[PDB]
Structures are given as C-alpha cells and as structure tokens.
C-alpha cells in the first residue's frame, strides 16, 4: 500500500509542484519530511503545518493532519471523493516557534490609574516595555520584567483614548479627548514636543507605521481617527500633519495603517473607506454594506466588524465589492485578529462567543464557548495554535486553535479584563474592578 500525494500551495509563499509517492505506513511527521525535502526547506525546527481537504460540515470530524496516511487514504471524512482515495491534499504554511517549560506563580500586579480605563500596548519580543493609557489623562510605561512603573507621561489635557507604540519602543503616541495626539519618548518620558493639532474632536483611534521601508523621502507615519469624522496622517519625527482624509460623515472608530500606502477606516456612518494617503488625500473606495456602525477593522483582505453583528471580508484592493458576509454572532464584535495569517480571522464578540473563520472559504472553523460574558479582547497567543481571549468573567482563557477546545483559564475574584497583549513568554492584562491591578503572567 502506498499513497499518491498531491500538494498545492495555499497563500502567497512557497511554491512547489509534483505529486510524490510515499508509502502508506508512514506517519504525519514522515509525510512532512518527504514534502519539505521537495519544497527545499530543511528538516529543521520549522514545523511545516498542514490543513487538508475543504468541507467538514457533516456528522463527523473531517480531516485532521496527524492521523496516519494509510488510515486517511481509506477514509478521509467520507471515503473521500472520486478524485481522492488516490491522493491526499495538503496545504502547507509556516510559522511557528515553541516555548517549553510553562511554570506558574500568580502574576505580579501593577497598580495604577486609580479607577480608570482604555488603552494597552506591549512591545512584543525583546521589549519588556508595556504602556497603559487611561481616562485619568495619563499613560504609564511599565517594565514587563520588573513590573514597576518606569514613568508616567503627564502631558494631556484630558482622557487618553488610544496609543501606538513603536517596536523600537522608543516612541509612544497618544490620542486624547483634548483633541491632540502627542509623541513621547518612552525612556525619557519626555514629550517629543510633538503635540499634534488639527483634530477638532476626540482622537479615538490610531495606527502607526513605526518604520517606513520606502526611501527616507517617506518616513514613519501615524494615522489617527477622530470623532470629528476625519483622519490625519502625521510624521512622527517631524510632528507635522501630512494629509487629511475627509469624507466620513460620522465618527471614525477604527483605522488600520502600516499598510504604508493604504489607509483603511471604519466609521459610525456604517462605511469602510480605503484611502490613498500620499499627496492626494482622496478616498479611492467606499465599502458599503454594514447596516450599522463599523467598530473594528483588520487589513490584510479587508475585514470589518459592525454593530449590526456581521463581519464583511473585502476582496482585492480595487473593485470595492465584498467577498463574504460572515454571520453568526449575536452582538457587537469588539475586536478581531486578522492578518496574512492563513487568511484566518478570530473575532471576539459581546455575545460572549469567539469565532475562528476561514476568510477565503467563509466557513466558521469553530466557536469557543465557556465564557460567561462579553469578550473584550483576543490574541492568537501561541500562534496559529493558540487563541487567548479575555472577558468580563475576569477570565483570560487559553484555547486550542485546532480543537477550539478550552485548555485553561486565568482569573478569579476581580472584576473584568479590558484588554490583553501577549508575547511568546508572557501575557499582560489590563484589568478593572473595584480593586485594580494590571496582571503580568510569565511562562
């Protein structure tokens, strides 16, 4: 008994072709070793990960990877198709990296911002720095390691609604009700002198392209969205307003940039606008669809989550027509994590459920259940592998992406977790409740 294999690439990335035959007895670990040899990537710690054979709505589970190939060949899900039963179909994509020994004493808490609110940033990787923003009108830079406050940035006239952090970690940006954004030096805790005026109303959201790949003529910029209904693109180094994007009737709740060339905005006027930031200031496309206010955005694909609890996926860059309408959540989806990550989207909703979606297919991979109340934030913590979600039920749970099963849950008596940031090593949670403390878990 042998298998014929047919592998076709999924997503932009590696390409290879040629069927290859391997014996039937072989395990998944052996199948990848044969495939990777062909691909020309080595048999190093590179996992090379599989997804299979499109379908699995049925009575049964469909086609898991790890099942031995002779067993799959007989019975994929059905016995297969007419065109299978002869081949096995593999979609191959990297990530992903391992962390070993978990550990566990209770997280250090760092008290701060009295009873306050809204933003969190953790510079992933080397950066130990965590930045919390609050209605208290200040921001605080903290050490993930020490869990002591490095500094508090006390420039703003009022409440800080949003922030952006550069991977260097050296620059911090904030948006306040005072209607200005400020650029700060996280180490010094010194205002850049960067006070950016121009917005009339509160600066609700911002996305920053920390570094610009393109020639120095173009520099790093931050885009901001405001209640005023407009967005502005700012030069971090020289605090100037390069362009203003007008055209939104209602407040701009969410924006994505870093596109370095594409500005994506979601507003209360139930519209999603795609923009050409550079000297033009013109909105090339307006995505119409959402019955209600657009709360969240992801920009690979363009994905919008609305109050009308629908999520729309938008096709390639010029056409402006919707790929698919994802339904199923009951209420407002607070946040979604979408990326080039295999075109996989994870959405957190008020409905207290979280869903994993295949943006290409439109299929719902799975829904995570078990949280009591609305889901405030999420991250694909481990990677493709793990999803981390936070809720009112004071819980940050770790879930298995593949199974959609719940592995374990973090918090007890407290109030709630507003948001989370996750690094490979640790999790930072901003919590609120009567007695407050931000939590830093290490593993």
């Amino acid at each position: 008994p042998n298998v014929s294999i047919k592998f076709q690439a999924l997503d932009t990335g590696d390409n290879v072709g040629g069927a290859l035959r391997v014996p039937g007895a072989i395990s998944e670990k052996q199948l990848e070793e044969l495939l990777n040899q062909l691909n020309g990537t080595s048999d190093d710690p590179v996992p090379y990960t599989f997804s299979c054979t499109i379908q699995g709505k049925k009575a049964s589970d469909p086609v898991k990877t790890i099942d031995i190939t002779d067993n799959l060949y007989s019975s994929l899900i059905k016995p297969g198709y007419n065109s299978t039963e002869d081949q096995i179909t593999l979609l191959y994509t990297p990530r992903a990296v391992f962390k070993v020994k978990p550990v566990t004493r209770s997280s250090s808490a760092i008290a701060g911002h009295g009873s306050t609110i809204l933003c969190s940033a953790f510079a992933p990787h080397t950066s130990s720095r965590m930045v919390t923003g609050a209605g208290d009108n200040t921001a605080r830079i903290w050490d993930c390691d020490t869990q002591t406050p490095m500094h508090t940035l006390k420039g703003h006239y009022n409440w800080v609604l949003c922030v952006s952090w550069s991977p260097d970690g050296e620059v911090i940006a904030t948006g306040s009700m005072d209607n200005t954004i400020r650029l700060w030096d996280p180490k010094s805790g010194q205002c850049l002198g960067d006070a950016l005026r121009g917005h009339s109303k509160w600066i609700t959201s911002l996305s920053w392209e920390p570094i610009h790949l393109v020639k120095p003529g173009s520099k790093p910029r931050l885009a901001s969205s405001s209640k005023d209904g407009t967005i502005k693109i700012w030069d971090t180094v020289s605090r100037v307003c390069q362009y203003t994007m007008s055209g939104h009737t209602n407040s701009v709740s969410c924006v994505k940039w870093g596109g370095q060339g594409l500005l994506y905005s979601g507003s209360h006027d139930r519209t999603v606008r795609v923009w050409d930031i550079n000297s033009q200031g013109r909105c090339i496309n307006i995505l119409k669809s959402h019955a209600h206010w657009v709360n969240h955005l992801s920009l690979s694909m363009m994905v919008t989550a609305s109050d009308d609890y629908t999520m729309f996926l938008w096709n390639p860059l010029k056409s402006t027509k919707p790929i698919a309408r994802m339904t199923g959540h009951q209420k407002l989806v607070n946040h979604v994590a979408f990326s080039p990550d295999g075109r996989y989207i994870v959405s957190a909703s008020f409905d207290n459920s979280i869903k994993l979606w295949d943006g290409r297919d439109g299929k719902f991979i799975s829904t995570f259940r078990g949280h009591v109340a609305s889901v405030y934030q999420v991250a694909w913590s481990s990677d493709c592998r793990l999803l981390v979600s936070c809720s009112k039920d004071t819980t940050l749970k770790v879930w298995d992406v593949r199974t959609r099963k719940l592995s374990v849950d973090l918090p007890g008596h407290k109030d709630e977790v507003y948001t989370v940031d996750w690094s490979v090593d640790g999790k930072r949670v901003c919590s609120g409740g009567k007695d407050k403390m931000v939590r830093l878990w290490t593993h």
Partner: protein, 269 residues
C-alpha cells in the same frame, strides 16, 4: 568539664542520639517530611524543592528531589557564577538573590524543553528577607513556584498592599545604590571602606540598575552552566590532601603505647 557535672554510664547508655543532620543543626525534619512526602496515588512522581541557602557570601540554588538512597540534584546555580553575566560585587544581596534565582529557572527549564517548592531551610520568614528574592527570580524566570506577596519588600503591613515600585527597586539593587548615593556626601570615610570595589572599578551608583538589567538579558541568553576548567585532577587533589590527614593505628601500636606507659609512669620512675 565541671567535676560535679560529668556524665554517668547510665546517662550515656540510655541516651538516644537525635538524627545527625539534626545534631548538625542543619535539617528541620518536621518541615522536610512535609516538603518531600508525595501523595501516595501519584506514585513515583518526585516532589522537587527549590533549595535556597545563604553562606557567608555565596548564594545556593539547587532544584532537588528525594530518593531513599539520597536526595538528587536536577539543577544547581550559585551566585558565584554571576561574574559570568556581568555581576561582580554584592553577590549575597537581594538583587543577587533575584539574579541567581532567575539563573536557576532559565537553566533547568532549558534542559527540560515546571512546578517546584521553596525550601527556605532554617531561614526566618521575615518580610523583605532575601530568600524570597530567590523566589521572585525563579518565578519571574518561568517556574511555577506557588507563593504569596507578603514577604517581598514593599509589602504594606497596615494594609493588604504591595508597592511594586519598591519591589522593582530591590530586584535591581535600588536600596544599595541609594545607600551608595547617600554615602557620597555625608561620609566618604565609610564609602571608601565598604563600596571600595565600586571605586576600584569605576561603577558609581546610578549604573547599578543597568548591571543587573543586563545581567538578566545575559542570563536568559546563555544559562547553560559553565563548569570551572579545573587545573589538577581528581588524583592530585586527593594526593596533596592526604599529606594533611592523620591516619589511625593498629591495636599493636596502641598495645606498645600502654606497655611503654607502664614501663615509664609506673615502676618507680
């Protein structure tokens, strides 16, 4: 000793000696029982203690487990390794305890691809003690070491509250620099006596936090434990050591010594 003290046959005959490790004042068997013994239905599942011990100026962290033949070291780190990571002074302070503890966690947790309990030994549990420094480092390091916060410095007595601005300050040697500051303009008599080496290597205060801050980085970067090079073998150390160890006797030699003695001490000078 004292003539009317002294010990009867009968005292000695019925004396029950305590263990040995107790006679040595080194083992609290009562606490050891409870640290070591495992749930009977988790069978051969070893119960690993993180042992933290302070000598007159070296810190010891071993991860240890038990066996009816003897205990068993999994991992060991000593604060005297810390020169390896850019730490040269005050290595029995709260921050060297933290550092060493982080070195212990990172090292073992490495060679493993982990739950563990604090063996404080005979240390008092005072709030701010540095045994608990070890603990923080092993815990910030990645181990699951079950513990509470009320023995870390900057624990408010008269309220259930931790000031972590303070506890950070200890991890990094902040109380040492602040003394080192304070001594730079109220007394340089003493500042040259203690804090001597800091002059001798030009490390004045303010930097102290960076030394440790990057001792941390250095550690996670390469925890894998360098044994000393050695210089002289097993055999030599042995041989030169036997130059200084008296060796017993034969009954025959002892026999002569008495016979010899009754030759002297006795037959009328």
């Amino acid at each position: 000793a004292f003539q009317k003290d002294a010990k009867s046959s009968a005292y000695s005959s019925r004396f029950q000696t305590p263990f040995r490790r107790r006679r040595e004042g080194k083992t609290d068997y009562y606490q050891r029982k409870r640290l070591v013994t495992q749930h009977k239905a988790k069978y051969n599942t070893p119960k690993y203690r993180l042992v933290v011990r302070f000598t007159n100026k070296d810190i010891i962290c071993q991860i240890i487990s038990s066996t009816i033949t003897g205990d068993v070291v999994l991992a060991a780190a000593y604060s005297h390794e810390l020169p390896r990571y850019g730490i040269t002074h005050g290595l029995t302070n709260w921050a060297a305890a933290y550092a060493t503890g982080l070195l212990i966690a990172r090292r073992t947790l490495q060679k493993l691809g982990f739950k563990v309990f604090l063996d404080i030994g005979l240390q008092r549990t005072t709030t701010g003690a540095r045994v608990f420094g070890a603990l923080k480092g092993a815990s910030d390091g990645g181990l699951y070491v079950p513990h509470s916060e009320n023995r870390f410095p900057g624990w408010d007595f008269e309220t259930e509250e931790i000031d972590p601005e303070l506890l950070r300050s200890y991890i990094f040697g902040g109380h040492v620099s602040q003394y080192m500051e304070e001594l730079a303009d109220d007394d340089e008599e003493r500042f040259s006596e203690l804090f001597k080496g800091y002059l001798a290597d030009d490390i004045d205060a303010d930097s102290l936090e960076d030394i440790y801050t990057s001792a941390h980085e250095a550690i996670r970067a390469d925890p894998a434990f360098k044994p000393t090079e050695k210089k002289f073998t097993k055999e030599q150390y042995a041989a030169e050591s036997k130059k200084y160890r008296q060796t017993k006797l034969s009954k025959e030699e002892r026999a002569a010594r008495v016979a010899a003695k009754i030759a002297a001490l006795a037959g009328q000078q």
